[PDB]
Structures are given as C-alpha cells and as structure tokens.
Symmetry: D2
C-alpha cells in the first residue's frame, strides 16, 4: 500500500536536506505537540512557552539569513509549515506570524538598530512578535484602514484599533500599520507602551489553540526611531503577507494529509457489515478523490517554492496556491469526518478540528474570493474587485 | 425584498394553525433559548430544566394522541422541529429523542402499564427518556448489535454497551435494544437500576449544547414486565427512527434558514470596497444558490409531511428528505460562514455552530450513505449495503 | 422497484385530468416521434409536417382560451412540455415557440383582426410562427437591441437582424421586436414581405432536430396595422418569455427523466464483473443522487404551476425553476452517459443527445447567470447585472 | 505584462527544455495550419481522411517514443506534449496517434518476433500502413479478463472466432492486434485485415469522436499461421501494458482540449460586450476563468510529473491512473463550462468547446473508465480490491 503522497511520489522532487527538515519537524510535532493538542484546543490555549520550543527547533524566521536564523530555502520553510499544520493550524499560525510577518517586516523594512534589537530574540523565541494590519471595518480592503499616526515634534502619536491579531496578547513587539499624512507607514510598537492594550478574543470555534486579539491604541506615543524606515504604502504590508501566504500554500496540505492518513487508518480498523470500511466502493471513491487533490496541491506548492527560490514568485502565482490548497484542504478534512461517523465529532481524530481551523485559513491572508479575483485580473487585465 | 422561503412562497402550502405553531415555537426559541445558546455551546451543556419548558410549550410527543400529548398532525411536528433547530440542533435533538424515540417506543410497543406510567410524565417534561440502539462497534448496522438479554427464570439480565446516546446521563428511563435467543427485543430500563451506568461524552466539537452518553449495562437484572411486549426484530427500533428522521427532514432546514437569513442581513450591513457586500455578483451567486436549495428542501419536507398525514410515509421516501435536507443544510451553513469572514469564526453568528452541529445530524439516524443506498435499493431492487 | 418520480409520488399532486394529459402526450411521443428522432438529429431536420401532428394533438397554444386552443391550466401545459422534451428538446422548443412566444404575443398584445387571422391556423399547426427578439450583438441584454422601426406616413419600416430564431425559416409570421422613437414595440411580419429574409443555421451540435435561423430585415415596409397594438416596452417580450420559461421549467425535467429511466434500465441489463451494473455502490450513488434532483425539480415545477394558475407567478419565482431545473437536468443527462460507457456515445440511448440539447436550454430564455442574478436582486434589493 | 495565458500564469514552460518546447510548437503549428481549417467539416461529416496517416508519419509522431524502425526516439515528455497539441486540435487526431503508436506499434515492438517488427514497424512509423488494437468486445470493456474471442489450435495453425467493438481505425487498418482467450490464457495475434473471415464494420451516428474511424470487428473462422501469434504476450498483462502507454499520452492529450477550449473562451470574453462592458470584466466570468485555469495548471503539473517519472525509473499503473482520472474529468468540466460563457454562439462548430466536450465523453470512458481508475487508486491506498 501507498500513503497518498507516496502514490504521487512527491518526495522525488525534494533533496535529502529538505526531506530531513520535514522529518525533523514531523517528529517534533508528534512528540512535543500532538500529545497536548486536544486539551489545548478544548481549553482554548496555546502556551507562550512553545515560543522557545519553536525557537530551539529552528523554525522561527527559518527562511531569513542571519541573526541566528536557519537560512533555509523557501521549499524547506514550506515543508516545515506543512508539518506544523499537520499538528494544528495554530502551530503554523504562530510561526507564520513570528517569521514571515513580524521578523520579515523588520528584516526587510527596518533600520539596523531595529534588526539588531529584535531579530536574534525573535529567532530564538525569547521575544514574540505580532502584525497589526486588519481592523474591525477593513480586512479584505486594508487600503481603507483608519488607524492613524500623527507627528508631535519628532514623536509619533498612534490612534486606532486592529482586530483578529494573532499573538497580540503574547507579543513583546507589534508591527502596526497606520495611515499618515504621506501614506501608509509601519511602526514597531513595544506592547508595554502606555495607551497600547491587547484584549484576547474568546469563544472561537476555529483556531482555539492560538492567541487572537484586539489591539487598541489610545494616544500611543513613539519616538521617530519606531517607524520602519523603508516601508511606504500598502506594498509593504502586502509583501509580508506574500511571505506568509507562501507558507500557508504548504501548511494547508499538512492539515489535509493528517486528516486523510488518520482517516485511511480508521477505515482499515473499522468493520461495517462484516467487512473493513476500506473495502467498500463508496469509501474508496472518497479516499481516491481526496488523494488526487492532496497530490495536485503538493505538486503546486513545490512548483511555487522552486520559482520562489529562483527569481521570486509573483503575488498572483501565490494566489493559485492559496486559493487552491486551502479550499481543497478544508474539503478533504470535512469529507474525512464523514467516514469516521460518530467518532469523528470529538477531538479524538483530527479531521473536525482541522476543518474548523481551516475556516480561519480560508479567510485570512486574503480570502478565497480575493485570490480568485487576483487570478482573474492576471488572466484578463481587468480588476473586478470594485 | 424577499426572505428565501418567501420567494418560494412555501407559506401558501401551510394552514393557519401550522403557521401559528411555527411562529409560536420561533418566538419561544428567540426569547428563551437564543440569549443562552452561545454560552451553552461553549460550556457544553444543555440544562435539564429545559425539559419542563419544552413540555409546557407542548412539543414533547406532540404528534402522539392521548397521555397529555398535543395530538398535532405531522406537518406541525415538522415545523416545530424546524424552529427548534433554527435555534440549535441540540434543542431539536432533545425533542426528537423525547418524543419520536423514547415516547414512541413506549406508545407503539409498550404495555398499558408502561404507557400509563411514563407517557404523561414524558409529555410534560417531568421525566426524560433516552433510546439506546447504537453500540461502539455497530451504528449503521444495528442488525449486528451484541448487547444481549438472557432469561433467568421470568427475569432478564442485560449485558452490553450503548454509545452516542442522547440524554443518557439525564434520563429517568432508557429504551434499550438487545439481541435475544429469539431475535431483537426492547426493554425499559430505569436508569438507577444496579449495573446501569451512563458516562457523559466530552470534547465534542458538534452538538455541544446536548447531552450524549455511553451506557454500560453490566448484568442489569429486570423483571419480565420491563420488556416492551410488542417489539420484535429490528423493525421495532427502525419504526422509531423513521418517526425521528421525519422530524430531522424539517429540522435541518431550520439550521439552514437561520444561517442564511443571518448571513443575508450581514451582507446588507457589511461594506467592502465602498459598497454593501450584498451588491457583488459573487455574493449574490452564493445567496441565490443557497436559497434554491433551502426552498427545494422545504417543498420536499412539506411533501413528505402531507404524505405521512394522509397515508403514512415509507422509509425510502423519508430517506429522500433525510439525505437531501441534511447535506444541503450543512453546505448552506458552511458557505454562509465564508461570507462572514473573520467574524464568522466565533459563536457571534450562527453559521459555524450550525455547520458543526449538522456534522452529527448528517451521521445519526442513518448516515447519508445509508439513505443513499436505501434509495438505490428502491430504484433497482438490489441491496448494495453488503 | 420504483421509477424515480414514483418514489417521490409526485402523481399525488396532480388530478386525473392532468395525469391523463401527461399519458396522452407520452404515448404520442413514443409512437410518432421516438422511432424517428435519431435520424432527425443526425440529419439535422425536424419535418415541418410535425406542426400539424402537434396541432391535432392539441398542444399548440394549449394554455390559451378560444381560437381552437385547448384552454388547459398551466400545470397541464407544463406536463405536456415535460413529455415533449422527454422525446427531444427540439419537439418542446417547437411547441414553446408556437404557443408561448408566437401565439401568446398575438393573443396578449395583438388586435382582434390579428388574432382571428393567425390564432386558429397556429393552433391547428396549419401556420407556423416565430419570435425575433435576440440579435447577434444582444441576447442577455435585449434592452440594448438595435433593430429599428420608423414611420413613413402611416407605414412602419423595420431594419435590423435577429439571430438564433427558432422556426425562422419555417414561419409564416414573425413577431419582431424593435426599438422606436417612443420605445420598444412589436410587429407581426409576414415572412414573404419584401426585405425579409430567413437564413438557416447549420453545424449545430445542440438542437439539431430543430430549425434555427438568422432573420435579416432590410427596410421591411409594413402597414400601421402590422403593429401589435398593446405592446409597449421591454415588458411585452419579457411577458412572452415568462410564459415559455414556465414550460421549460417542466420540459427540462422530461429530458432528465428520459435519460435517467433509460439509464436505470441499462444498468439492470448490463453485466460487469459477473453482476448487473445496478448492483454496485458507485452505480447506486449516481442513480440516487440523480433521482433526488429530478424529484426536487418536479416538486418545484408543480408548485410554480399551482401559483401560476392561482394569482400568477412572478418572474423571479419562474427564475428559481428555470435556473434549477435546466442546470440539474443537464447534470443528470451527462452523469447518465457515464453509466452507459461506450454505447452512450451514439444516438442509440438518449442521454448524450439530451445533454447536448440542454446546452441550448441552459442559455436561451435567460441564461443561468441571468436567472441567478434575478434571484439575487429579489433577495437583496440590489441589481448586480451591471 | 498586463495578461497571462492560463499556463503562462503557472509558468509550466520553465519545467520543459528547449527541445521539448520546440516539439510542442512544431506540432501546434501543424495542427493550426493543416488540421484546424478542416476540422469543422470533418466532424460534421463524420470523417477523418486516411491520408492523414502519412502526414502524421512525416511529422514524426507515429511511434515517436519508440527506438529504431524509423521512429523518432523522443523521450516520454515529448510524446506527451505532441499528444497535447494534437488533442487541442481534436481528440480524433490524438486518438489516431494513440492507436497507431502506443497500442498497435507498441504491441509488436514489445511482444512481437523480429519478423513481425521488420514487416510492420517501419511502415507503421511512416504512416504507410495503419494498425488497430482489438481488445474490447460488445459484452466486455471495463472487464477484459472476461473476453470471449477465442483462438484454438489446429495443428501448428490457429483459428480465431469472436467480435471486437469500439475499435479505432478498424476499417482503415492493414493489421489488427487481436486479443483472444486460449486454453492456456489470453494471447495476442497479428491479423492482416484481408484475411478471409475478418470483417470491419464502421460505427456511425456517434455524437463523440465523429472525426475518427471506430469499428466493429467480426472474426468468423479466421485461420492464421503459428507465426501470427505475438510470441511474448501472455495474459492480460500484455494488452494492459499497451493501454498503460496510451493512457500516458491521454494524460497530456486531455489538457490540450482543455487549453484550446479555455484560451478560445478567454478571447471571446474579451471581445464580447454585455451590458456595455466586455464579458471578461464581470465577477461571474472571472470566477469561471480562474477556477478553470487552476485545474488546467494543476493537470499540467501532474502530466509533467508523470512524464519525468516515466523517463526515469518508470511510472506504475496506479500513478498513471492519477493522471487519467484527473486530467480527463477536469478537461471535460473545463470544456463544458467554457461553452456556457459563449452563449448561443457556443452551440455550433464555430468555437471548439462543445466539440471538445463531446469528444472527451469517449476519452473519459476509454482506456479505463473514470471509475476503473478511481478504484485502482483505491486499491493502491488500501490494499483491498473493490471492483467486485
Ligand atoms: C483567527 C484569525 C487570525 C488572523 C486573522 C483572522 C482570523 C479569523 N486576520 C484577519 C484576516 O486577514 C481577515 O479576517 C481577512 O482579511 C478577511 O477580512 P474580514 O474578516 O474583514 O472580511 P471582509 O469583511 O473583508 O469580507 C467578507 C466577505 O466578503 C467577501 N468580499 C470582500 N470583498 C469582496 C469583493 N470586492 N467582491 C466580492 N466579495 C468580496 C470576502 O471574500 C468574504 O467572503 C489577521 N489580520 C491581521 O492583520 N493579523 C493577523 O495576525 C491576523 N490573524
Ligand atoms: C451526537 C450524536 C448523537 C446520537 C448519535 C450519534 C451522534 C454523533 N447516535 C449514533 C448514530 O446513529 C451513529 O453515529 C450512526 O448510526 C452512524 O454509526 P457509526 O458512528 O457507528 O458509523 P459507522 O462506523 O457505522 O459508519 C462509518 C462510515 O462508514 C459508512 N458506511 C457504513 N456502512 C457502509 C457500507 N455498507 N457501505 C459504505 N459505507 C458504509 C458510513 O456512512 C460512515 O460514513 C445515536 N444512537 C442511538 O442509538 N441513540 C441516540 O440517541 C443517538 N444520538
Ligand atoms: C438553439 C437556440 C434557439 C434560440 C435561442 C438560442 C439558441 C442557442 N435564442 C437566443 C437566446 O435567447 C440567447 O442565446 C440567450 O439570450 C443568450 O444570449 P447570447 O447568446 O447573446 O449570450 P450573451 O452574449 O448575452 O451571454 C454570454 C455569456 O455571458 C453571460 N453574461 C451576460 N451578461 C452578464 C452579466 N451582466 N454578468 C455576468 N455574466 C453575464 C451569460 O450568462 C453567458 O454565459 C432565441 N432568441 C429569440 O429571440 N428567439 C428564439 O426563438 C430563440 N431560440
Ligand atoms: C470512440 C471509442 C473508441 C474506443 C473505445 C471506445 C470508444 C467509445 N474503446 C472501448 C473502451 O475501452 C470501452 O468503451 C471502455 O473500456 C469501457 O467499456 P464499456 O463501454 O464496455 O463499458 P462497461 O459496460 O464496462 O461500463 C459501463 C459503466 O459501468 C461502470 N463499471 C464497470 N465496472 C464497474 C464496477 N466493477 N463497479 C462500478 N462501476 C463499474 C463503468 O465505469 C461505466 O461507467 C476501444 N477499445 C479497444 O479495444 N480498442 C479501441 O481502439 C478502442 N477505442
């Protein structure tokens, strides 16, 4: 017999170092995270202590060069994301935010002082970052954001609210995007600055094993040096999103794979009408169709990773993978749950948890519809968002 | 503008008393249950005190005659289930179990003594019933059940485990189905009988606002009089399931309607890219497609109810409704959630809760695949379960 | 065993006169049309003499009163359309055009003299009508039409081109819609009028057993009396479309039923791997899913017909049926073909022919997307066509 | 750059070398200049002229992945790209080539004697002779193990009796590879089509693959010498090995029909105005275009992946099933969806989508139905066969 991706033979597309990274992260997930995940999800906690475990593993800022970062290629970051999310999307979300959003914002747009202050600590998981773009009234359309930075002498004064901010209540530093007299700018906000409050969001059905927050900035005063000096316009936060989105292209496949392998095993173990469930045509149809989507998504992820490591990948190319792999992953998790029957309604087997988590992954970092329309613009030359 | 079912004009198919029942139950849901459902779901409880509230409302055993039961037609019972499930599937599940499973088992197969002892209290919600058919190893195939009742003189001794039993930990009496030397039989088990233990199931992601239990029967000794005297073979429990399934055909539509109406209101209020979300083609596509399925399902529910009242409805006819209305309802809830964006991931707006709940509804009272194959058998004359 | 609609028991929703009409038309189709349809499709012909057979049967203008028309209710007209299309969509298309487009245009908007000139012959099939609305450049948006009718004294002169006009080359009289200085108006154009040319369309893959034409109007001069006196604005042609669309709501279900019943019979007779094809789960899944859509569509059609016969049916209500029933019918025809294997690629068994014909039905009388957006506007109050 | 073609957006050309891209371009230009001007008439009239055999032979596509005998000796990825371009023309063009190379020639190349190879392969490669492959019977298609055509020994000679059905090129062929049951199991025979007792009857009134010859073969007391047996073919494995070669071509070919449909339709949406703007400007249109592009590109990545495995250690049947199941069913969905965007104009032979969709009905069914490939994948994942 073959595992779903073994049937496709996606491993032939990876070198030994890449395969070793995947195996290493998978082992970490199996030993350190999997035994605790059901309780973390039920209780709606993801302990701050995991930051150091992820730091020590090497995954925080792993695609970045220097500052104690691993300095891997893009494919390797993707595989790590895939393995984290196979554990739980909350694990991958923590890492997406730390590396591709927080650390990348500083790496790409920061001063030397900012890079030297924060990057080693963030790489080690000794500090935690967050990325405040979305607001209650603006998610898909961040160009409309209302958070505002005004100058007071050489200082800045920030006022606004950000919403749905992963790690907001855990962070030491927030990368906050705000309108200014000269256009959108980014600021590093120490989270102990007076006027800065993070309020944790509870009663989530998705991403319970994750910290998600409202950030309220009430006359937050910062020095001139707090601005990320190179970030100008919406292109700056969007560049960070394109790094994180790349990780999600791989990550969603991990949730899908974990669901599907767990469910194939269940079908072998469960007898219905005196035969294993895996013996019936209806079961095999589902397993085959799900396998076909998972393998196509893995081929697409690796393809995009190879482009990224060569000349770079364009946003509309990332959109192929973000649109496809998240929507096909949530379909796989949901279909798997049907094969588990009653046993599938609890936290015992991963599919329903994965499906719930993937609701957030479908929406964040650009909704399916935003990516759909980005592809449509690339094919036609006509923007149809408005 | 039209509400989805208003566009179909399904009200024209209903008489005044039926429409009044729907309105009465909807007002009860809105006032007594909706203010509390978010907390009930989060904390995984459905208070036992609701038994008396449902009893006083008149919905427990409402389609039965006598014993303080309402004696309504089948369409009215359907509409009540639709309105209860629009609140939450846990509300409708409580009522399905109390009336169509527990009370119906006693009404149809019980002695006069059993009916007089239990039916008035169950109708009033002064006692709670449960129905123990499913076992850890046998759900879709109850013919294979291994709970056993053996004779000891004129007494019976029951041994087995039932699983996924709604209201198990709240019930005063359990209808327990068991194999015997002469075939499947049913027994009324007072829940304080020595050897009978109910263990509540926790860490559910679906039907959290509902009590679901394991029942362990360890040499439970009963008198001859505890047997349901008229129940012989699998036909007896299945007749109860067909009563309950009928209610679910309507119930699932309630969860779908509540999701859809909530979501339409959200799309009218939420502005994206300077216009209400409801203005966009992609939004209207979703709203129209969902409306089309909801109305078709409503026509099918009413059609089946009219058949049931006029002449009885066959199991394979119920299967049309149970297969269709549950799977289309869960699709509607899921698609609604996408339109809500990030706000849809919490308990604030009903779609994600309804989607999760409908995972159980899809599986219980015969999975989609069971109803699919029952329809296949009716069309071809060939059973394809084995 | 049950036929698909027998399992639903849609016959219970009809009276005996209605059921008798369905049976009469089915017998006519089976005896007079079916033995010839494969040759007609292959040769791309539909003999003009069939007009008289349809006329004698009573289906031409059957829902109209007087003028030798049958004067049936709307449900009966729907059932006749269903049975005609079960034969072939080209048969139903002939009847849709003759009755609901041509004759209804004259009946509803025509003068006393026009009605007496044409309605009795059109009802008998001794004359043939057509309906010229669509232009090469304007189909979904007939408000944009450019055929123009101008005055010259009391005469009218029409100039423009109509396209995809069913029966154009066969018609004695054409109802032609044109823009004027005062808005859209309608005209009865005898097809021997100087300047009026019909050119037949060939190399169709859909609706080969049907005549479809280009109409070229080169300054066609008519008397004042040729105007349909009561037709003003786009509402007039659309009212005719709404009559024809209603018949299509039923008609598409006939193509679906014919495909499905033919395919069920094939699966019972075809042995694969030593058992009838109907015995396999994959087969039964398809048969069951297709049955579910066919029956839901039938319930919707009958519901719309009862509304139509009472206070009248609104366009957006018709859109529910036209959107749903055509797109579900083409899916049934296509899925059926897969079950036939190689034998399904020829004209021997109806599915592939039906699927091809339904391509036209999906597009004409308002595309799926037009009906979709019509429903969206009803739900939201916002038009999203532009 | 303001716009990208669907596969340009994926950048699948970066996965191909110059020689491979040159082959695609060469076959595309042949299809555009020689075949496309005639395809509408050929489909309507239900003809595919036999002269095309020599034209395909001269082009180099007949037996292109085979070595020797005047064959091109290309890699498998190049054969795939040629099939993609032929099918973008019409599936009947690709079907001709599938049968000639991967079924007829390959049967002889793999299982034949030296004498058979020398007699037939050079002519077949050149398109100076035409071959066909008779596996399917009226009663047995998805289950060829159940075939009833029989070969019985008469001394040193053979006598064959049976009927084959749905045989591409049957009425044009000079030689038929005919699969038959024997006392010792399934065997293969080269049957010259002028052998007394061998008759080919052409199938008419097709709605799919009208620009292709499809036949019934009837064998009544067909006598053959011992030398007519393919000596190395034993059991169902032999015909299935031929199918696995042809199926690989189809994994690519179906994408050609999809691409041709989709690019034709994107161009139409750019030029067609509805409600005062190009049809391409609307969200509903862009939704369709994007979803179809996503499937086309995923399919192309899968095809190239399978080709690279084939040119390395080799592709297993269940891996080919991934491609055949996926790419054909997604291609037919693309062609159908494209047709909706064309409106009325899409119902004729003018624009390719409806013709492609009809042709793909055959492609979905032949060389193993979607359900056969689905269940082969299921068996690979579970270790349980669910055919019976
Ligand atoms: C758990 C979790 C965690 C995070 C985040 C979300 C969640 C749920 N996000 C926020 C996330 O990026 C945000 O939810 C998405 O951008 C979507 O925006 P809204 O939720 O406002 O939906 P919004 O209101 O924009 O969209 C609602 C619906 O409208 C549709 N739509 C929008 N525009 C349309 C158009 N023009 N045409 C048609 N349809 C259109 C959308 O596709 C969607 O279906 C975030 N943010 C952040 O800054 N930092 C973070 O760390 C995180 N993390
Ligand atoms: C919250 C909740 C509440 C309740 C219940 C469940 C849940 C989740 N049920 C139990 C319920 O009826 C049961 O879950 C279903 O019958 C399905 O059985 P299993 O969960 O054992 O799945 P099972 O293991 O039977 O099926 C697993 C999967 O295999 C598929 N399958 C099964 N047979 C097949 C075949 N022959 N061919 C192909 N596929 C096949 C199924 O469709 C499903 O997808 C119950 N029970 C009870 O007695 N009293 C109660 O009050 C309740 N309430
Ligand atoms: C065989 C046959 C027979 C007939 C007819 C057609 C055919 C094929 N019709 C013509 C028919 O009514 C016409 O084809 C449809 O109205 C669709 O118009 P177009 O073909 O111009 O497509 P058009 O160019 O309008 O539309 C093309 C595509 O764009 C989509 N689209 C259009 N507007 C859009 C928007 N605002 N947003 C998003 N998408 C949009 C459509 O849904 C479609 O998918 C006819 N006519 C007649 O007058 N008399 C007759 O007898 C017949 N009979
Ligand atoms: C135009 C064209 C051209 C060719 C061919 C076909 C056509 C249409 N073929 C024949 C082709 O290979 C054949 O049609 C397929 O193998 C399918 O077999 P049947 O048509 O007998 O369907 P069959 O009767 O086997 O199958 C009918 C349906 O049942 C399903 N089914 C079968 N077994 C099942 C099971 N166990 N469980 C569930 N479902 C099952 C199938 O998937 C299908 O949906 C051929 N042949 C050849 O030898 N040489 C050639 O050149 C060609 N060329």
């Amino acid at each position: 017999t073959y595992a779903p991706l073994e049937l496709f033979d996606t491993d032939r597309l990876l070198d030994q170092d890449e395969r070793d990274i995947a195996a290493t992260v998978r082992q970490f997930v199996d030993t350190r995270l999997k035994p605790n995940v059901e309780g973390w999800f039920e209780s709606a906690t993801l302990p701050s202590e995991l930051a150091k475990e992820f730091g020590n593993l090497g995954v925080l800022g792993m695609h970045l060069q220097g500052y104690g970062c691993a300095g891997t290629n893009a494919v390797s970051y993707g595989l790590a994301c895939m393995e984290l999310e196979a554990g739980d999307s909350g694990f991958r979300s923590f890492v997406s935010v730390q590396g591709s959003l927080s650390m990348f914002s500083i790496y790409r747009y920061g001063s030397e002082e900012q890079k030297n202050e924060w990057l080693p600590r963030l790489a080690a998981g000794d500090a935690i970052g967050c990325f405040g773009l979305t607001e209650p009234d603006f998610g898909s359309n961040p160009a409309g954001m209302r958070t505002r930075a005004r100058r007071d002498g050489s200082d800045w004064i920030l006022n606004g609210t950000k919403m749905w901010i992963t790690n907001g209540n855990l962070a030491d530093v927030a990368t906050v995007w705000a309108q200014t007299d000269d256009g959108i700018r980014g600021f590093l906000v120490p989270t102990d600055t007076p006027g800065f409050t993070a309020n944790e969001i509870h009663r989530k059905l998705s991403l319970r094993a994750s910290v998600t927050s409202e950030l309220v900035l009430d006359n937050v005063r910062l020095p001139a040096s707090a601005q990320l000096p190179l970030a100008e316009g919406l292109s700056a936060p969007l560049s960070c999103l394109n790094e994180a989105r790349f990780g999600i292209v791989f990550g969603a496949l991990g949730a899908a794979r974990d669901s599907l392998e767990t469910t194939i095993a269940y079908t072998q173990s469960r007898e219905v009408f005196d035969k294993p469930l895996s013996n019936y045509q209806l079961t095999q149809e589902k397993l085959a169709n799900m396998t076909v989507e998972l393998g196509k998504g893995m081929l697409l992820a690796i393809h995009l990773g190879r482009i990224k490591d060569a000349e770079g990948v364009r946003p509309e190319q990332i959109s192929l993978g973000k649109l496809n792999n998240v929507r096909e992953a949530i379909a796989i998790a949901r279909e798997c749950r049907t094969l588990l029957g009653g046993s599938g309604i609890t936290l015992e087997y991963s599919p329903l948890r994965h499906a719930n988590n993937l609701e957030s992954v479908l929406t964040y970092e650009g909704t399916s519809e935003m990516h759909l329309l980005s592809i449509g613009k690339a094919l036609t030359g006509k923007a149809a968002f408005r």
